[PDB]
């Protein structure tokens with residue numbers, strides 16, 4: 001089959017022949033907005049280009065952007081380990097048109113790359129597409145120009161039950177370029193639970209969203225009002241891991257080449273006994289986020305981005321501990337991570353030791369309170385009559401043991417236990433008021 005690295009190459013090449021300028025992936029730290037926690041999409045570095053504020057010598061580009069969706073408007077952290085298609089760290093294979101080609105060529109390029117016997121050649125019967133309800137052009141293009149069956153062109157209205165809370169209307173974040181979009185889904189077939197988009201069981205992992213194609217029409221200014229973009233443009237992202245799963249004839253992103261090997265490296269250093277465990281996937285994912293974030297200059301901390309990183313690190317250590325890790329293990333996964341990435345882990349080779357060091361200190365510190373905190377937790381769980389852990393307990397784990405609220409929640413989740421988040425909030429606010437009183 002085509003390997004992950006081969007797929008990334010083919011994609012960039014294909015769009016290069018179609019006149020797309022290959023641009024280097026930006027860092028996970030976004031200096032284009034301070035507003036933004038981490039790079040969450042390939043279009044981020046081109047945000048101001050779509051607006052017309054930032055000007056380039058190319059009218060189309062193509063990138064393989066590294067993204068972390070662990071925060072803000074794009075937060076997939078809690079999905080990690082429960083689906084076979086979600087990561088914190090993942091790569092977006094995307095093509096961009098700035099004032100150049102619009103819908104017809106955008107859809108044509110996508111179909112060509114996916115279906116062509118000469119490129120990488122998915123079964124046509126398997127593919128499904130979605131369009132925004134109002135998008136008649138897109139529908140007609142798929143139906144007439146491409147030749148897709150009407151039964152497989154699902155229209156999606158503002159179906160999240162707010163104007164337009166739509167899977168087919170994509171917005172950058174709180175502000176920025178946006179517009180209706182069309183998505184390409186692949187059927188991994190009958191054995192997986194799940195139905196097509198717009199269907200009750202649309203969330204299930206059978207029909208996977210491979211490629212989103214956003215027709216950039218509008219800009220969201222500040223206030224809610226939606227001004228038009230100077231020139232209609234195209235923004236697409238195909239998930240490298242998800243398409244690799246299709247091409248490599250697997251169903252889970254965690255069965256693709258680089259995850260097969262990465263999970264084995266996790267089993268080695270944790271003493272894990274079976275390779276089909278939730279925690280192995282979680283750790284394999286988290287090492288990608290943490291290692292790359294640090295390599296891009298994010299130092300673990302208690303403030304802002306550093307804290308999100310710290311949280312992910314600690315959550316990963318917690319899983320390793322559960323698997324039976326006898327000693328510091330997390331930093332040992334940097335090496336194997338560098339191998340299974342190669343071209344894409346460039347910056348990560350430069351600093352390897354700096355990253356291994358940061359990840360080592362971090363785990364070494366959390367381990368100082370980890371197991372004692374887990375005991376505190378287990379005690380309190382037994383005292384529980386109900387399915388909800390009191391907020392005071394959650395606050396104690398945070399205040400004393402350095403357990404981020406979501407980490408505690410992740411532990412309780414595995415036992416069908418909720419954590420009373422209102423109480424945690426109350427306890428947290430009560431300390432801010434004590435700090436405010438004492439300090440004045």
Ligand SMILES: Nc1ncnc2c1ncn2[C@@H]1O[C@H](COS(=O)(=O)NC(=O)[C@@H](N)CO)[C@@H](O)[C@H]1O
Nearest residue numbers: 041076086087090209210211212235236237239
């Ligand atoms: N958490 C995630 N883990 C793995 N892959 C993801 C994740 N989120 C998105 N992707 C992949 O990236 C693709 C694009 O993401 S998208 O939000 O739907 N669309 C966009 O980001 C638009 N900005 C396109 O420029 C998706 O189709 C999916 O294949």
Ligand SMILES: [Mg+2]
Nearest residue numbers: 167183209212
């Ligand atoms: Mg989506």
